């Protein structure tokens, strides 16, 4: 099946990504707090709902929150400033707080039920966001010998997410706070730069060209 691409709102970042965030893939963004990772997660939740000539997939979003950083009014602001009805945009986001890593795994199973349900409608799920994906795994699996256990449990959770992405043609977007193995399709490092900008760099992506993207956090979410 054709790979769909969701615009980030930034032409610079979209170019770095090869056109946007891909369906049939897990894109991981990582960086320090305020680096743009979570602002990008909120922006994509709006952008996916747009028609393709506007950078979206005529889809809906699902958002797993692990550290209570989801802000519905921020989604409403981004939507309103892009010409969209804020409440209709918020209605196209399914939201869940993951209480712990085991609950996070169950939420991925439940996401499959909603994905299946909406698959052949005019607005299928096209984006599944997991914000600070590793937070509960780092809090719970700690101490002597915890590296192997944590990495196996994360590898399984990521394999579950890859299957949803591939089986249902959705984009899976995950964020993480800054030698460990990783299994996302594409990893993007974000940092603050000068002039209030954020800088993006692809990590271990020989398949994508050399460069860094520059973007701003605005009332439209993310843009150049
Ligand atoms: C202040 O106004 C609001 C208005 C809306 C929201 C969010 C966007 N919408 C909601 O919370 C809706 C309102 C009700 O219809 C239940 N609901 C779910 O989204 C319920 N979610 C689920 O049942 C559910 C299962 C499994 C899930 C699995 C996932 F991976 C991700 C999300 C998942 N979400 C917020 Cl945070 C604030
Ligand atoms: Ca952020």
Residue numbers in the entry: 108 to 285, 304 to 349
Passage from the reporting paper:
More detailed exploration of the SAR around 6 led to the discovery of CAM833 with a 6-fluoro substituent on the quinoline and a 2-chloro group on the phenyl leading to a further increase in affinity. CAM833 has a Kd against the ChimRAD51 protein of 355 nM (n = 8) as measured by FP and 366 nM by ITC. The lipophilicity associated with these groups was balanced by the introduction of a trans-4-hydroxyl substituent on the proline ring serving to maintain solubility (clogP of CAM833 is 2.73, and tPSA 120 Å2). In this new binding mode, a shift of the backbone of CAM833 allows the NH of the right-hand benzyl amide to form a hydrogen bond to Val200189 (subscript number refers to the equivalent human RAD51 residue, which differs from the surrogate protein residue numbering) via a bridging water-molecule rather than directly to the protein backbone. We attribute this to the truncation of the His residue back to a Gly, a change that can be tracked in the X-ray structures of intermediates from the optimization bound to HumRadA22F (data not shown). The phenyl ring of CAM833 sits flat on the protein surface with the ortho-chlorine atom sitting in a groove leading from this surface with both making beneficial hydrophobic interactions. The quinoline more completely fills the Phe pocket and the 6-fluoro substituent binds into a hydrophobic sub-pocket which has opened up due to minor movements in the residues lining the pocket. Using structure determination by X-ray crystallography, we show that CAM833 engages with two hydrophobic pockets on the surface of RAD51 that normally accommodate conserved hydrophobic side chains from the BRC repeats of BRCA2, thereby directly competing with the RAD51:BRCA2 interaction. Using dynamic light scattering, we observe a shift of the average particle size from ~40 nm for oligomeric RAD51 to ~5 nm particles (corresponding closely to the size of a RAD51 monomer) in the presence of excess of CAM833.
